[PDB]
RNA sequence: CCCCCCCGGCAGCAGCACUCGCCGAAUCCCGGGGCCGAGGGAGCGAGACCCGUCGCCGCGCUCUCCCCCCUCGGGGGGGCC
RNA sequence: GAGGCCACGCGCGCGUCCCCCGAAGAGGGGGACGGCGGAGCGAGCGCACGGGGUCGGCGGCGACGUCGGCU
RNA sequence: CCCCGCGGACGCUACGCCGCGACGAGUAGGAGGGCCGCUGCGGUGAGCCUUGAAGCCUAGGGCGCGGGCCCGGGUGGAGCCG
């Protein structure tokens, strides 16, 4: 089966590797952004509550 | 189940001579090879005529 | 002449390898171009609907030109007209699937077999899942699995279709050579719907499964193959 | 020749590298590394010796077979996988970390609680529920047949001897050389003997695991007891 | 409490406060359980000789040179226009 | 002008476009693209989601009592 | 110009062997195959057999989808089978 076997898909569709690589890179970038954005919100929440 | 009809599955045709003539069978062997290993459609027609019955191989007069 | 014949075979082998290399680069770049085309179509419908709503108007999309038809009833007690049309749709078995190009002639055929089929409008994903997992070619009257691109090119290369991506592009965007590319595909032999059906004996709009479910055919397809 | 380099294409998912074909082309500097153009003796000559025997003899190695069987078996096709067991990747469950208390499920040490030390080259776990506690020596075990509990001791900075390998623990056999038909009983040597080396290794590891066991209260009592299923308790509701 | 505001601002956003969707060229990663292992001479090459670790496909290193970080030659990285 | 991507990477000559001076907007000097032009060749190790399973993994037990025999 | 090696599996009853794909209900009825079975004749097996044929019996061992068949043990006493 393609869609389950990477090399079988690449034999039929060589462009599937760059789409898959771009997706994995993009999803890691988006995940990192949402993690850092959320931590900043918590850090601002802590700062606005323990500002003294 | 599949919606097909099985009454015409088997094609009725001569795959070999019904005769037991060993000289006819030897030159059927020769033309079975020549039909398979050449692109000549002449050898294909001659091979299938060798299979045919006597009534399907009528005599040819000299005239 | 041993040295010269070695050179001849090396040159012939190297020439064939370069031809394979060039054909692989073409296949790679066509899929890159198709990916650009697919996202342009997807964004355009969103963009057209947005400018209509901005002006207070209504954007009516193009009527779908591709259908996936699934036969859902068996082969027992079928009237002769329904039996004939199902054969013309290449649906001779239950849970068989076939892509159908939609027009007046084909739609009126779908109305006749309406209690016997479930159909709808496949999206890009459904076409990819069907061709990649269950795509078989009718090659020399034989059901051959689409495991190599050379099987498509030898049968459909005269139409410009030389890879899985070209076959998918022709099916999805109903092209000039849809009839040849669609008839090349052996009709899809799908499994039973995992999770069951609602009711195969009534229409979809009345709580059942028969008839035209517009784009819910994709939900059916995911469970079906 | 040149010194080997690292891959220069980091893996991000198995089978997919982080960089594309052109990106790896520039990383490798393939634009300047462009190349266009520029055994075993089967027979041996040996001096045969002796007068008028000729000079030497062209003695060939690997003489042709003396006998051929009446029929053979065709050779196999090729499989592009199916590595030998020694080349398999060894997988360990995340709940089994060095120092984890395990529960043995099979064997004569059934139900005993032991201490996990390290995974061996075959993937078998090396455990020692210390011999002074529950009579389990340094012994191999299979991760499929153990239960990893939650309680752990920090067995970091202890020194497991390096000779403690799979070959160290592999069973030894005597039978059967110089003996074909059994008319005198060969039941001797059936008494497995504990080597002095095994006792030395047992003492060496246990001398530095036992103080860490005594560090937390009544863990030694826990290790002395065995695991059992009471009629009220069910393994699917138990947190281990 | 509801509606209209002269207008809102901030965060989040079909919500990791489980109110209500349709999806994936706008989709990828990982894990677990079950059943199965059919086939058996794939070598254009050396003129094979240990049982063809072979084809297609996807990659890594070397035939260039500098560095960097751990081990004590080995391992892991940055590249080099 | 203090990042990302590319299945972009030899020369020579020819073409197409862009830039400079342009002393006839001549004539040369530079970039980009090319599917154009008469002339042979990369090899050497590996890893594998790659034309259907293997282990270059292992254990226990065996004569008057037990082992196998779906018939 | 092969040769430090003088060497290199199996196959192809061609009425044989090998590959790929689809398919498999069945009365009346039709057809094909039968190394299914019975009896006798021409050939053939330098076939079997009083050191035991045919037949029969058998909680014995098997083969074939099947028709059926082979082998062991007993009984039997002169013929039998491919
Ligand atoms: Mg059927
Ligand atoms: Mg029928
Ligand atoms: Mg019915
Ligand atoms: Mg279920
Ligand atoms: Mg009805
Ligand atoms: Mg969301
Ligand atoms: Mg097999
Ligand atoms: Mg039938
Ligand atoms: Mg009948």
From Swiss-Prot, chain A:
Q: How is it modified after translation?
A: Citrullinated by PADI4.
- N6-acetyllysine PTM sites in chain numbering: 17, 37, 48
Where on the chain is Phosphoserine found, per UniProt? 49
Q: Where is this cross-link: Glycyl lysine isopeptide (Lys-Gly) (interchain with G-Cter in SUMO1)?
A: 48
- Top-rank taxon of the source lineage equals Eukaryota
Which sites are covalently linked via Glycyl lysine isopeptide (Lys-Gly) (interchain with G-Cter in SUMO2)? 11
Record's signal peptide: none
Its subcellular locations are: Cytoplasm
Report the sequence similarity comment from the record: Belongs to the universal ribosomal protein uL4 family.
Per the entry, what this protein does is: Component of the large ribosomal subunit. The ribosome is a large ribonucleoprotein complex responsible for the synthesis of proteins in the cell.
Share what the entry says about its subunit structure, partners included: Component of the large ribosomal subunit. May bind IPO9 with low affinity. Interacts with RBM3.
Q: What is this protein called?
A: Large ribosomal subunit protein uL4
* Source species: Homo sapiens
> Which lineage?
Eukaryota, Metazoa, Chordata, Craniata, Vertebrata
Swiss-Prot record, chain B:
Is Cytoplasm a UniProt keyword of this protein? yes
User: What domain of life does the UniProt record list for this protein's source?
Assistant: Eukaryota
Q: Which GO terms describe its cellular component?
A: cytoplasm; cytosol; cytosolic large ribosomal subunit; cytosolic ribosome; endoplasmic reticulum; focal adhesion; membrane; nucleolus
Instruction: Give the subcellular location.
Output: Cytoplasm, Cytosol; Cytoplasm; Rough endoplasmic reticulum
Main localization of the protein described in the UniProt heading: cytoplasm
Name the keywords, alphabetized: Cytoplasm, Diamond-Blackfan anemia, Disease variant, Endoplasmic reticulum, Isopeptide bond, Phosphoprotein, Ribonucleoprotein, Ribosomal protein, Ubl conjugation
BP-aspect Gene Ontology terms = cytoplasmic translation; translation
GO MF terms on file? RNA binding; structural constituent of ribosome
Keyword flag Mitochondrion: no
Family membership: Belongs to the eukaryotic ribosomal protein eL18 family.
What this protein is reported to do is described as: Component of the large ribosomal subunit. The ribosome is a large ribonucleoprotein complex responsible for the synthesis of proteins in the cell.
Q: Which medical condition is this protein associated with?
A: Diamond-Blackfan anemia 18: A form of Diamond-Blackfan anemia, a congenital non-regenerative hypoplastic anemia that usually presents early in infancy. Diamond-Blackfan anemia is characterized by a moderate to severe macrocytic anemia, erythroblastopenia, and an increased risk of malignancy. 30 to 40% of Diamond-Blackfan anemia patients present with short stature and congenital anomalies, the most frequent being craniofacial (Pierre-Robin syndrome and cleft palate), thumb and urogenital anomalies. DBA18 inheritance is autosomal dominant.
Q: Subunit composition?
A: Component of the large ribosomal subunit.
UniProtKB/Swiss-Prot annotation, chain C:
Organism per entry: Homo sapiens
Q: What is its main location?
A: cytoplasm
Matching InterPro entries: Ribo_uL30_ferredoxin-like_sf (IPR036919), Ribosomal_uL30 (IPR039699), Ribosomal_uL30_CS (IPR018038), Ribosomal_uL30_euk (IPR005998), Ribosomal_uL30_euk_arc (IPR035808), Ribosomal_uL30_ferredoxin-like (IPR016082), Ribosomal_uL30_N_euk (IPR012988)
The name under which this protein is listed is: Large ribosomal subunit protein uL30
On this chain, the residues bearing Phosphotyrosine are 116
Secretion signal: which residues?
none
The cross-references to PANTHER family, in alphabetical order and at most eight, read: 60S RIBOSOMAL PROTEIN L7 (PTHR11524), LARGE RIBOSOMAL SUBUNIT PROTEIN UL30 (PTHR11524:SF12)
Positions of sequence repeats: 8-19, 20-31
**What's one GO BP annotation on this UniProt entry?**
rRNA processing
Q: Which family does it belong to?
A: Belongs to the universal ribosomal protein uL30 family.
Q: Where in the cell is it found?
A: Cytoplasm
Region annotated 4 X 12 AA tandem repeats sits at 1-31
Q: What keywords are annotated for this sequence in UniProt?
A: Acetylation, Cytoplasm, Phosphoprotein, Repeat, Ribonucleoprotein, Ribosomal protein, RNA-binding
Location of N6-acetyllysine modifications: 101
Q: Which residues carry this modification: N6-succinyllysine?
A: 104
Record's subunit section: Component of the large ribosomal subunit. Homodimer. Interacts with DHX33.
- Functional note: Component of the large ribosomal subunit. The ribosome is a large ribonucleoprotein complex responsible for the synthesis of proteins in the cell. Binds to G-rich structures in 28S rRNA and in mRNAs. Plays a regulatory role in the translation apparatus; inhibits cell-free translation of mRNAs.
Q: Which GO terms describe its cellular component?
A: cytoplasm; cytosol; cytosolic large ribosomal subunit; cytosolic ribosome; endoplasmic reticulum; focal adhesion; membrane; nucleolus
The keyword Lipid biosynthesis belongs to this UniProt entry's keyword annotation: no
A single Gene Ontology molecular function, please? identical protein binding
Swiss-Prot record, chain D:
One GO cellular component this record assigns the protein to is: membrane
Q: Which InterPro entries match?
A: 60S_ribosomal_eL6, Rib_uL2_dom2, Ribosomal_eL6_CS, Ribosomal_eL6_KOW, Ribosomal_uL6_N, Translation_prot_SH3-like_sf
Presence of the UniProt keyword Lipid biosynthesis in the record: no
Q: Which residues carry this modification: N6-succinyllysine?
A: 46, 159
Q: Residues where N6-acetyllysine occurs?
A: 191
Q: Output the Gene Ontology terms for molecular function.
A: cadherin binding; DNA binding; RNA binding; structural constituent of ribosome
User: Where in this protein does the record say Phosphoserine is found?
Assistant: 79
Q: Where in the cell is it found?
A: Cytoplasm, Cytosol; Cytoplasm; Rough endoplasmic reticulum
Q: What is its main location?
A: cytoplasm
Q: What biological-process terms (Gene Ontology) are attached?
A: cytoplasmic translation; regulation of DNA-templated transcription; translation
What PROSITE patterns does its record include?
Answer: RIBOSOMAL_L6E
One Pfam family in the UniProt entry: Ribosomal_L6e
Which key words are in the record? Acetylation, Cytoplasm, Endoplasmic reticulum, Isopeptide bond, Phosphoprotein, Ribonucleoprotein, Ribosomal protein, Ubl conjugation
The protein's assembly and partners: Component of the large ribosomal subunit. May bind IPO9 with low affinity.
Functional summary from the UniProt entry: Component of the large ribosomal subunit. The ribosome is a large ribonucleoprotein complex responsible for the synthesis of proteins in the cell.
Indicate the family of this protein: Belongs to the eukaryotic ribosomal protein eL6 family.
**Which named protein is this?**
Large ribosomal subunit protein eL6
Organism ancestry:
Eukaryota, Metazoa, Chordata, Craniata, Vertebrata
